[PDB]
Amino acid sequence: MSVGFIGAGQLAYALARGFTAAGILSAHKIIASMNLPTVSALRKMGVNLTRSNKETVKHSDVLFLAVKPHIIPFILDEIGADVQARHIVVSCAAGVTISSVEKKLMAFQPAPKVIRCMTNTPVVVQEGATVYATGTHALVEDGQLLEQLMSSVGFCTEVEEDLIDAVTGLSGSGPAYAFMALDALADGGVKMGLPRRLAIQLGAQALLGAAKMLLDSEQHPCQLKDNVCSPGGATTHALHFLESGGFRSLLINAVEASCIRTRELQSM
Numbered sequence: 001m002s003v004g005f006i007g008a009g010q011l012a013y014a015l016a017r018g019f020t021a022a023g024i025l026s027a028h029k030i031i032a033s034m035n036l037p038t039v040s041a042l043r044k045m046g047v048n049l050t051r052s053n054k055e056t057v058k059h060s061d062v063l064f065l066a067v068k069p070h071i072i073p074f075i076l077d078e079i080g081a082d083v084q085a086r087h088i089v090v091s092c093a094a095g096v097t098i099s100s101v102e103k104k105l106m107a108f109q110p111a112p113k114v115i116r117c118m119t120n121t122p123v124v125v126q127e128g129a130t131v132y133a134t135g136t137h138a139l140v141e142d143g144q145l146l147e148q149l150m151s152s153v154g155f156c157t158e159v160e161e162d163l164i165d166a167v168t169g170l171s172g173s174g175p176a177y178a179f180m181a182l183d184a185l186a187d188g189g190v191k192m193g194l195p196r197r198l199a200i201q202l203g204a205q206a207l208l209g210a211a212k213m214l215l216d217s218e219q220h221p222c223q224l225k226d227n228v229c230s231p232g233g234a235t236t237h238a239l240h241f242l243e244s245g246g247f248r249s250l251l252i253n254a255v256e257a258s259c260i261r262t263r264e265l266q267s268m
Contacts, residue, residue: 001029001061002025002029002030002031002059002060002061003019003025003029003030003031003060003061003062003063003064003149004030004031004032004033004056004057004059004060004061004062004063004064005030005031005032005033005063005064005066006032006033006053006056006063006064006065006066006067006075006079007032007033007064007065007066007067007092008032008033008036008038008039008042008066009038009066009068010038010121011066011092011119011121012032012038012042012064012066013038013041013042013124014119014121014122014123014124014128015064015066015119015123015153016030016042016045016047017042017045017124018123018124018125018126018128018152018153019149019152019153020045021126022126022152024148024149024152025149027045027046027047028046030046030047030048031047031048031050031056031059031060032047032048032049032050032056033049033050033051033052033053033055033056034049034051053075053078053079054078054079054081054082057079057082057083057087058082060087061086061087061088062087062088062089062090062145062146063079063087063088063089063090064090064092065089065090065091065092065093065096065101066092066093067093068093069093069094069095069096069265069266071093072091072093072096072100072101073100073104076100076101076104076105077104080104080105080107080108080109081108083105083108083109083112084109085109085110085111085112085113087113088113088115088138088142088145088146089101089105089112089113089114089115090114090115090116090117090132090146091114091115091116091117092117092118092119094118094164094165094168094172094262094266095165095262095263095265095266096116096266097116097161097266098114098115098116098133098135098136098161101114101116102114102135102136102137111137112135112137113135113137113138113139113142114135114137114138115132115133115134115135115138115142115143115146116132116133116135116161116164117130117131117132117133117146117150117164118130118131118164118167118168118171118172119150119153120154120171120172120174120175121175122154122175123153123154126152126153126154127154128150128153128154128155129154129155129171129174130150130153130154130155130156130171131156131157131158131159131163131164131167131171132146132147132150132156132157132158132159133158133159133160133161133164134158143158165259165262165263165266166255166259168258168259168262169254169255169256169257169258169259169262170255172258173254173255173258177251177254178207181207182200182203182204182207185199185203186199186200186203187199189202189203210224225239
């Protein structure tokens with residue numbers, strides 16, 4: 001019937017701007033919780049600024065917790081009065097254990113339904129990556145709706161919550177790597193004589209075509225790289241410069257640090 005996003009950050013608008021295109025839920029049935037354009041642009045779509053956390057729970061059948069990990073512990077005390085066994089709560093905040101959202105909302109009422117997820121920000125273009133873990137009192141029907149809700153958003157599967165911290169470094173911090181990568185590539189286009197906008201547009205579809213090829217064609221990523229490299233070609237000379245500076249090594253210890261700190265920060 002109606003979904004509600006307590007948050008208003010980039011993630012909140014990303015879900016709303018991604019839910020509206022597929023039409024699983026329209027822009028009329030939504031409740032939120034006012035200087036940034038995220039609320040104003042969503043207000044152009046019809047998002048309601050309740051400005052009170054409790055003023056949205058009873059109006060939101062399923063609630064998404066888009067608040068920050070430091071805001072979410074005290075948030076549970078303010079909404080648990082309006083949390084009910086009918087309401088499906090989905091915590092989008094990283095490092096938030098399912099116990100924290102279930103044990104805190106256990107005091108207000110029994111049988112709390114919660115789900116932990118890690119959806120990316122490139123869901124505005126309907127191609128994000130997310131995973132979820134079913135809570136204790138989260139039934140099969142509750143998870144079937146969530147996947148269907150975020151499968152319109154992109155890749156959505158059921159992983160166990162002990163692996164969502166590692167997905168954070170690969171699916172959550174991942175898109176930032178391509179932004180910096182597509183910057184350096186575009187910065188290489190100008191140095192070799194390409195316009196800035198064309199250097200952004202040419203490389204962007206090259207990353208789409210490389211990612212889309214690996215997804216549907218289940219060949220190993222290196223095998224797809226080997227078929228591109230023609231013997232005695234320009235591609236093999238360029239790949240040498242990447243592996244000399246440890247191109248693979250940097251991206252490897254990057255995901256490690258993103259997952260390591262998320263565990264350290266959650267220890268609070």
